[PDB]
Amino acid sequence: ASGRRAPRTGLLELRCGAGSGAGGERWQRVLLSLAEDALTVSPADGEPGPEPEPAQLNGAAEPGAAPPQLPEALLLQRRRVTVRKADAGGLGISIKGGRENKMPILISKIFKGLAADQTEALFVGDAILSVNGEDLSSATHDEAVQALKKTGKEVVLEVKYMKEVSPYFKNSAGGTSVGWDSPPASPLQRQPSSPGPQPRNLSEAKHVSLKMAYVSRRCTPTDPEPRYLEICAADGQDAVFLRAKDEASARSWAGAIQAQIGT
């Protein structure tokens, strides 16, 4: 099953037992799949599958010098360039750095059109740090040369596009909405309704419609920013609340559900 589009799936912290007693909480990891107008929850795995040692067996694409169709999502961060001598060719760039004080190593030039040239992945404006699978951030310029110079066959250089890493003046991160926590009227008697069909059980999957769903943000477990999200299905069908790994992960979660539902 694969039709271009794909629902955003991620792990979140969901509570258990604490529904209307408050006598023994329990937060566990749970996977959440948000497509568009529907969210399908499900448990996550634990044992590791794909090892970080293997690196394909040279194939996929015949031409070029790297398996095309490289998705971003969680890989769009920094850059993982490579230099294959037994495929692309030799390297000929002019770097410059000086960590002796506080000058990070970066691309100063790309002499001729060597492997460094054909490798668009790299360009005169990136700072190296993790090469051939080894962070040498604590290896001044000289060490940078020997790091990529000693390598061979496949030099996986991991650089970071440094530009506006240090913003100017305070004008981001931080805000006080205040006012979205005082409803005019909220029935607290005709909510439970008569006992009958109510999809509020946790078995294996928790599918909920994003038609009249609501997203909330409450803090408690030492959450002075991230906080846990709350998904109330029209406050009359279901209510799944969970917290992400980082504050941003929740910003994207609540931001994705809110931007999707738009109730």
* CB contact at 8 A, 82 and 157: yes
- Cα–Cα distance between 47 and 147 in angstroms, integer? 34
CATH architecture of 6-44+203-263: Roll (2.30)
Rg (CA), the chain: 25
* CB contact at 8 A, 110 and 116: yes
C-alpha distances in Å from residue 76, one per residue of 72, 107, 120, 121, 161: 4, 20, 15, 12, 11
Domains in the chain: boundaries: 6-44+203-263, 78-162
Find, among 180, 105, 189, the residue nearest to 142 by Cα: 105
Q: Which residues are bridge partners to 182 per DSSP?
A: none
Domains 6-44+203-263 and 78-162 share a fold: no
C-alpha distances in Å from residue 163, one per residue of 98, 125, 139, 160: 18, 8, 21, 9
* CB contact at 8 A, 154 and 82: yes
Neighbours of 39 (CB within 10 A): 25
Class of domain 78-162: mainly beta
- Cα–Cα distance between 17 and 23 in angstroms, integer? 8
Length of the chain: 263
